[PDB]
Structures are given as structure tokens and as C-alpha cells.
Ligand binder design. Structure first.
Ligand SMILES: OC[C@H]1O[C@@H](O)[C@H](O)[C@@H](O)[C@@H]1O
Length: 451
């Protein structure tokens, strides 16, 4: 037996996103977002599910905060719905939308919970999409004007700020694969969108500094460790390319002020040679108080000479792993290896785990309990590896469990449950899962026992 104890001031949190939990999609003057439009189009979401009602958090936030206080989370990461603030993306401010998040933040503080705000978690106002969306560079200024309203109203009571959540998913799934809003399918557009997402991050950070906000700001990137299939140089180079086309396409601009050259080479080979102003990468790499990342699984990559990419997943390795209800492999060591790479490659930054969690099939037993043993095991195993990285010198400051509530899992709808709290989407009843009660004790004890 060994006792696992995290650092004295370690921040234990849980995370949600506005569109995934709030509902009230057309109430109090809120403007239509691209995810309203995407969800209302048949064939885009599993089972025709929508985020129209979701968890109805807009009306039940007081119950959800009381649940947060029972579990004892020290920080709550949520996102603000831009179209609740500016229904047209710019123009007239909707005070009613503002007052919602002002109230929500105030009750969180009154309940001893530290708020942590994501400014952009994919709900772009549809009016801005009608003018090109993130393909239009003007949208990066509209985002900064919206951030200024939030910074002015909440900046000096919210200690932790995330500009963007997973720009790489917005780019890849929303603008190349087209399976996320706004449903666009064009490689060049998705790369222009990637740049403008990053540029809006840099503009918001610059504004954050110029407003002298007494808080910390960062960005939340989707990151995984990409393992080479072997120690042969061809597989290492293949995994390096895979990473630079995924999370490192955003990591390197943010922390080093340059796109990865090996990924640029590939896009040039495909016929796409990118050209952005010199100062754009300066702006993108504004110093940030921490780097934050969402991690769930790991990749395993092999050299694939006859393919266009030059690499492919090492399926013979991947089939040895257990999988979650999402079909993702479970490999806890991948979180240690990822944390150690962040610490090694980027000058030992302060690091925040803005999301970690797992989806499993949930069952409400005859006792009313949800005995989600596999979810507990996932979290405990991944947290053990995060603790290991801390012992080896990584400046990991916070851990946000995805998610507080079962919610709208984008194109999967309500078919995938990530919560430590079960939500019945027909009755809106909340039931804390056994994983929620486990986390409650982890927080109280600042860790757990390993047998
Ligand atoms: O797949 C589960 C989660 O993926 C995350 O990386 C996204 O930020 C969440 O919005 C989503 O619910």
C-alpha cells in the first residue's frame, strides 16, 4: 500500500460547457448559435438529439451548485455563451444574458467555489457564421470585443480564464470533416480557421494584459501523446508528424510563436502553402500564465510509406487495450508521458488539466445508486499518473474532471455519459454517481490510497 497525496494547494475541479448543459436555447434574447443550427438539421446528431433543453442548467444552476458543494469541488470550469451576450455577435449587448453569468459567478463564490471561465466553447453566433465565421478575420476582433465585456464585468472575481477550448476540434471536425458545426468540409478553410482561432486568442490575451486583469489566463488545447509503433527512426518521425498535425499545430504557435515545420512541409506537399502576417505569430504567442489541455487517450502511429499522410494508426498495438464507451483506448501512462513532454519541451510551464474523464454505460441500480466502477478506475489510474509527473517535477497545478454532469456529447447527443452526476434527460433529475462520491473523498483527502 502507498498513500497518494497531491500538492498542498492543488486545485480539484470539474468542467462543463454552455451548449452541453444550459438549454434555454431561445430564451432571454439569446441569439442562435452555429450549434443550434447544426443540431436542428436532420442527420447531424445521433438520434435527432438537440441541445435545446440539455440539462436545463440555465434554470437549475442553483441545484447544480448545491451538488458541487456536496462533492466539494474547489473550482468549477464553465463556458459563457457568446450569443447570450451579443446575440448578433456584435452590436447591442444583451444585459439579461450578462446578468445570468454575473449571478452564476456570484453564487459560486458565495459557496466557496472558485470560478474558471472559458470564453469560447464552440457556440459561435450564427449571424457571424453568415458572414464567414472563423474564416473571416473580422471575427477575431468581434471575439475580443466580447471578451472585453466579460473581462470588465467578471475579470477581478474570476481567477482562471481560458480563451478557447479545443480550437483544433473546431477546425478539424467543424471545417474539414464537417461532422461538427458549422459543417464545413474544406482543408484550406479549416487551416485559415485554425489561424484565426489562434489569432483571437492572442488578441484576447493582449487585451487581458492591457486591462490589467488581476487573474491568470491561458488556453485549453486537445492534447495526446503520439507513441511511435517502434524505436525505428521512421516510426518516431511518423509519430512526430502525427503530433505536429494535431495538438502541436496549436501548441507550437502559442508557446513558441511558430507553426511546426514538419506539418507545414506536408501541407505544402498537398498543395497548401500558408501565408500569414509576421506579427500574427508574435500576437498568438503572447505570454500566458499557464498552458491547459484536455486529454483522454493516446495515439499509436506507424510509418505508412504508400499513404498520402505517410503515417497511420498502429492497429495491432491499439487492439491490445481496453476501451471506453467512446471506443478510445485506456492507457493511463500516456498522461504521464504527455505531462513530461510539456514540461520538457516548453520550459516547465505551469500546467492545467482542463478536462480528463471517461464515458461508460451507466445503470441506475435498484438502490438508486450508479455503481460506475469502470469510471472510478479510469479516473484513479489517470490521476495516479498525473501525480507521478508531479513527483518528477511537472508544474501541474489543477485537474478539472470532465464532466460534472451528463450532457450533450455533440454529434453523439445524449448517448455518451461523461458525468460524475447522472442526468435523466427526460425528467432533468440529477443523481450523484459513485464516481461523484469517490471524487468527493479524493478532494477531502487530497488524493487516495493505492493497494
Ligand atoms: O468527448 C468529450 C468532451 O470532449 C472534450 O474534449 C470537449 O471539450 C467536450 O466538449 C466534450 O464533451
Amino acid at each position: 500500500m502507498s498513500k497518494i497525496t497531491f500538492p498542498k494547494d492543488f486545485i480539484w475541479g470539474s468542467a462543463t460547457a454552455a451548449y452541453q448543459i444550459e438549454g434555454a436555447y431561445n430564451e432571454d434574447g439569446k441569439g442562435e448559435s452555429i450549434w443550434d443550427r447544426f443540431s436542428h438539421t436532420p442527420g447531424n446528431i445521433a438520434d435527432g438529439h438537440t441541445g435545446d433543453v440539455a440539462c436545463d442548467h440555465y434554470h437549475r444552476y442553483e441545484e447544480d451548485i448545491k451538488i458541487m458543494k456536496e462533492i466539494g469541488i474547489k473550482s468549477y470550469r464553465f463556458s459563457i455563451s457568446w450569443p447570450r451576450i451579443f446575440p448578433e455577435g456584435t452590436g447591442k449587448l444583451n444585459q439579461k444574458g450578462l446578468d445570468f453569468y454575473k449571478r452564476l459567478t456570484n453564487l459560486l463564490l458565495e459557496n466557496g467555489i472558485m470560478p474558471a471561465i472559458t470564453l469560447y466553447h464552440w457556440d459561435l453566433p450564427q449571424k457571424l457564421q453568415d458572414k464567414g465565421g472563423w474564416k473571416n478575420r473580422d471575427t477575431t476582433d468581434y471575439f475580443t470585443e466580447y471578451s472585453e465585456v466579460i473581462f470588465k464585468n467578471l475579470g477581478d472575481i474570476v481567477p482562471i480564464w481560458f480563451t478557447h477550448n479545443q480550437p483544433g476540434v473546431v477546425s478539424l471536425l467543424g471545417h474539414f470533416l464537417g461532422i461538427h458545426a458549422p459543417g464545413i468540409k474544406d482543408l484550406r478553410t479549416s487551416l485559415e480557421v485554425s489561424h484565426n482561432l489562434l489569432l483571437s486568442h492572442g488578441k484576447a490575451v493582449k487585451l487581458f494584459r492591457e486591462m490589467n486583469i488581476d487573474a491568470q489566463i491561458g488556453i485549453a488545447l486537445n492534447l495526446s501523446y503520439h507513441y511511435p509503433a517502434s524505436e525505428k527512426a521512421e516510426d518516431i518521425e511518423a509519430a512526430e508528424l502525427s503530433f505536429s498535425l494535431a495538438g502541436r499545430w496549436y501548441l507550437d504557435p502559442v508557446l513558441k510563436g511558430r507553426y511546426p515545420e514538419n506539418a507545414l512541409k506536408l501541407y505544402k506537399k498537398k498543395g497548401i502553402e500558408l501565408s500569414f502576417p509576421e506579427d500574427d505569430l508574435k500576437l498568438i504567442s503572447q505570454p500566458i500564465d499557464f498552458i491547459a489541455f484536455n486529454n483522454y487517450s493516446s495515439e499509436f502511429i506507424k510509418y505508412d510509406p504508400s499513404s498520402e499522410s505517410g503515417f497511420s494508426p498502429a492497429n495491432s498495438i491499439l487492439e491490445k487495450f481496453e476501451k471506453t464507451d467512446m471506443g478510445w483506448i485506456i492507457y493511463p501512462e500516456g498522461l504521464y508521458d504527455l505531462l513530461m513532454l510539456l514540461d520538457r519541451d516548453y520550459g516547465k510551464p505551469n500546467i492545467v488539466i482542463s478536462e480528463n474523464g471517461a464515458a461508460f454505460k451507466d445503470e441506475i441500480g435498484s438502490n438508486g445508486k450508479i455503481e460506475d466502477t469502470k469510471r472510478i478506475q479510469y479516473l484513479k489510474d489517470y490521476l495516479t499518473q498525473a501525480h507521478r509527473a508531479i513527483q518528477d517535477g511537472v508544474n501541474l497545478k489543477a485537474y478539472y474532471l470532465w464532466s460534472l454532469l451528463d450532457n450533450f456529447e455533440w454529434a453523439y447527443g445524449y448517448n455518451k455519459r461523461f458525468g460524475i452526476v447522472h442526468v435523466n434527460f427526460d425528467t432533468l433529475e440529477r443523481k450523484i454517481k459513485d464516481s461523484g462520491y469517490w471524487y468527493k473523498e479524493v478532494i477531502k483527502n487530497n488524493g487516495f490510497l493505492e493497494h
